Symmetry: C2
Subunit: 456 residues, 2 copies
């Protein structure tokens, strides 16, 4: 059962895209993929596949997807909204607005600022997902539950993707505004930017065209259940929107949109506040990726229960690209579509780092167990290559949800000292870094933004 | 030309599929789902599409908003707490809700649980607002009922009372110590093995569901908002399919597991008095006599563009199910139910005989009639009285816009002070003029709701 090509705005221009994507989906098993490209006054949209495997409908440019972690930028934009009005400062401590907030470390609980949450420099355990109902008290109970959150590293030491840090970021918006986050996000960002179809609950998306998530196991893909994230995770990644609205979001952040943030504040979100992971830079919620001289990708990735998305934009060039898939393997599509649009519309040259292996005597020093909070990473020496074998521990989306189907193993190839990238689909493209301790021993293995402790 | 999706028995339902395929193109309903249970044989029939913007074939497993049918589920939970010796229908409400209050002080102290389940409260029945998506939504609504005025004193004039089930549902919450949606699972839903019986959009979204359709001037369109307030879940927030309503039907026929005693279900199906339009009122059940010993026991359902109907005949292992996703599906709810009764049991449907009234006599019933959710105008046209409904809004939410008014319908008499509409989509709805002791018209009961004569 091959994939469908539902809608293509320009057929001749996106012809290479149509064939490049229509191929991958057959490979990975992605049920549906929505693409949107922006270049000056022109907008290029393309829809592939079906919304659901059980309930198929053609994926279009207006199809509603769960953009996932892209919502963090909306939370940051809403916070910078409050910074411009003189109500919040990024250097202010969190306890200035939530005096009851606390994590396991008391010294960190009193020194963490708003800037720490938006730059993932808190240091506590990030991937922490519980459910506290569907009422407006869900987010306030999430933050109070963070009192047991242990410290992985002290703050401002080793960069770590922090989902839990945005519970506080959204809760700060709740307190300073005095309204629920979903209403406040709608008040400061959605309504002024004319984001018509941008929702947080399933009771607003049912009557339209939406996508469901898919997990792929041995015998193929299947619908991912449950479809909805906990309400307390909405400031983290609970937004549901389409390509046509992500275009409006891109125009604003490119300086070509309305002024809910002055240009000065918008460029501050896109100024590197420090290093992130895998050669990326950390803005204010924004990820910055150097490419070709002045050309650098600003954006963020997304991923819920079976819905993997990506959003990027080039400042001063009026360029943007959105890719929204409904499979746990759509990240491979997210990368190739983003790369082609930059190489096709901006004519840039991409930094393809040289892939190499090492003598197996050295590779044996990297193999072993690597323990995370959401999954395990398993490196074993097979042939002249190191192979990554991931194993989800369970706990997503709910604390009782089952372990998701593990992806097929992939070979690891070095492109720099202590830096690797996966060479086989569907993990192909994900970079990793071995952070070593003061004695020279492996202290962490950062992969996908998360830190894994060497167990051996 | 409407696609036929599923038929369990094409031969036995040969005449059925033809009647529905024609009735859908006439009224404009996008999809219906039919389920017939007779003995050990079950007959299902899938029809049409789940949506006009996003069609999908409707099957027996397609999730429909059964609407006010949920009231029967709420009464089943309370009747389960009846058997456990936890609650009593004759007990006042304040025994379980000591803070409960309506505008009338005496009624607040005398209303019982039986009053809630039999629509005999007397306060304003149609009262809807929103208090969030949390487990506190039902508590804030019952507390907001402290201002609901009295239309009539209790046990005087029967009237449909949605509000009473806010309290009847809240009584389940306090007695069990769980949310109302959870308490229903623990009491009836899970004991009867009905997985696909949900209340929230976030649980139905991953499956096949039907969206509501409203019929306006430019034709039918997808009804927004799809969602009902969480506090209205004890009123009519249940979402399920035909496959699950069979087990629910089988249970009340006795051919299911006994979470309720046999005499309890019989006491639920026993008429506790007269309701509206010749129907009888049991414990949440609506009883309509048709022929001899055969009686239709069931309930209607109505949400934002989804009309449903569920009836069963005790003593015959018989039950019918018709779920439509458009506001004009009521004629198909009656037609399929009417056909199924005398096709599988062989009875004779009570088709009322109509007689005409001179215009000098009809003019005594004409005038303006004011209601809560809609307005009624009775107009003399030729040798007939014409009903004109004018909704004012407030459904599903207190700020929702008024729905398109249904086409007017002529009114024909079948008994003194008793009418029945003759034109679609109102064809079949009977009305009643209740006369005060002084002989003047006190109320016009239409659609189970009361209307005051205009001043």
């Amino acid at each position: 059962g091959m994939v469908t090509v539902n809608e293509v705005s320009d057929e001749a221009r996106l012809r290479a895209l149509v064939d490049r994507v229509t191929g991958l989906m057959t490979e990975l098993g992605v049920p549906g993929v929505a693409v949107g490209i922006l270049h000056g006054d022109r907008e290029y949209t393309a829809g592939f596949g079906v919304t659901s495997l059980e309930n198929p409908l053609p994926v279009t440019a207006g199809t509603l997807f769960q953009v996932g972690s892209i919502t963090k930028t909306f939370t940051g934009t809403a916070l910078m909204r409050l910074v411009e009005a003189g109500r919040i400062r990024l250097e202010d401590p969190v306890r200035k607005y939530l005096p009851d907030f606390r994590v396991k470390d008391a010294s960190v609980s009193a020194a963490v600022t708003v800037r720490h949450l938006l730059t993932h420099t808190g240091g506590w355990v990030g991937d922490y997902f519980e459910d506290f109902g569907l009422g407006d008290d869900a987010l306030a109970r999430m933050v109070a539950a963070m009192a047991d959150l242990p410290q992985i590293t002290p703050p401002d030491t080793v960069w770590a993707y922090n989902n839990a840090g945005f519970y506080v970021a959204g809760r700060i918006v709740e307190v300073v505004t005095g309204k629920p986050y979903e209403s406040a996000l709608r008040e400061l960002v959605l309504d002024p930017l004319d984001l018509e179809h941008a929702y947080f609950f399933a009771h607003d998306v049912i009557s339209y065209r939406f996508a469901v998530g898919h997990l792929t196991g041995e015998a193929g893909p299947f619908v991912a259940r449950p479809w909805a994230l906990p309400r307390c995770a909405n400031p983290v990644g609970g937004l549901i929107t389409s390509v046509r609205e992500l275009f409006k979001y891109a125009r604003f952040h490119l300086g070509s949109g309305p002024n809910i943030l002055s240009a000065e504040a918008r460029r501050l979100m896109q100024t590197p506040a420090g290093a992130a992971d895998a050669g990326r830079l950390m803005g204010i919620t924004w990820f910055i990726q150097p490419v070709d001289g002045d050309i650098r990708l600003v954006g963020h990735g997304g991923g819920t229960n079976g819905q993997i998305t990506l959003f990027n934009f080039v400042p001063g060039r009026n360029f943007a690209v959105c890719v929204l898939t409904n499979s746990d393997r759509g990240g491979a599509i997210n990368a190739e579509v983003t790369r082609w649009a930059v190489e096709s519309f901006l004519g840039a040259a991409w930094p393809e780092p040289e892939i190499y292996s090492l003598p197996p005597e050295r590779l044996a020093t990297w193999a072993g167990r690597y323990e995370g909070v959401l999954s395990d990473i398993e490196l074993v020496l097979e042939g002249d290559w190191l192979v990554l074998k991931q194993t989800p521990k369970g706990g997503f989306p709910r604390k009782d949800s089952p372990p998701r189907p593990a992806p097929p193993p992939s070979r690891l190839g070095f492109y720099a000292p202590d830096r690797v990238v996966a060479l086989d689909l569907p993990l192909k493209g994900s970079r990793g870094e071995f952070l070593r301790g003061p004695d020279g021993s492996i202290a962490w293995f950062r992969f996908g933004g998360r830190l894994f402790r060497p167990g051996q």
